[PDB]
Amino acid sequence: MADRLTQLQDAVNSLADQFCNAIGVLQQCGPPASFANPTEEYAQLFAALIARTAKDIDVLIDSLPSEESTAALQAASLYKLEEE
C-alpha cells in the first residue's frame, strides 16, 4: 500500500460514496413546501466536498507517470543496471 495509485483508487471510491450520500441526504431530509436552513447548509457542504474530491483526483492523475516511459524503456534501463 501507500502509493499514489491507492490514493487515487480511494479518492474515486470516495467520489462515488459522496454521490450516493448526497442523493440519500438531500432526498430523505428537506423542508416540506409552500405553494430547512440546516438542509441548505448540508447541500452547500456536500457540493463543496464533491468539488474538492474532483480537484484532488485531477491533481493525483497529473502526478502519476506519463505515456512516455514505456515498458521497453524500463526494461533496457533494467538491463543496464544489471551490468553496472
Binding site: 470516495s14 480537484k55 514505456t70
Partner: protein, 97 residues
C-alpha cells in the same frame, strides 16, 4: 441508511475529507508523441538511458512542480490545490522497503 443525523453526517464529512485531503500544482505535461518503443521507435541507444539515470525527466523520473521543487518517485509531495489551509499529500509512488 434509514436516518442521517447532524452528528453522523458530520462524521461522514470528517471521514471523507481525511480520506481525500496561489496554486502550487504540478507543472502541466502535454501529450507525448515520441514514445520509445511504440511511438518514435528509437533503436536501443544510450542518451535515453543516461537521461533516465542522471538527468531530470519530468514524465519518467519524477514529478516537477511550481515553486521549482523536484520530486522523484520515492518521495511524498505536499501540495495545496485549493485556497484553503488543507494540504493534499500525494504519497510516494514506489515506497522502497
Amino acid at each position: 441508511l434509514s436516518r442521517n443525523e447532524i452528528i453522523q453526517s458530520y462524521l461522514s464529512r470528517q471521514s471523507s475529507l481525511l480520506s481525500s485531503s496561489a496554486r502550487q500544482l504540478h507543472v502541466l505535461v502535454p501529450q507525448s508523441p515520441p514514445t520509445d518503443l511504440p511511438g518514435l521507435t528509437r533503436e536501443v541507444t544510450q542518451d535515453d538511458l543516461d537521461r533516465i539515470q542522471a538527468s531530470q525527466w519530468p514524465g519518467v523520473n519524477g514529478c516537477q512542480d511550481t515553486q521549482g521543487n523536484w520530486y522523484d518517485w520515492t518521495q511524498c509531495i505536499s501540495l495545496d490545490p485549493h485556497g484553503d489551509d488543507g494540504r493534499l499529500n500525494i504519497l510516494p509512488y514506489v515506497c522502497l522497503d
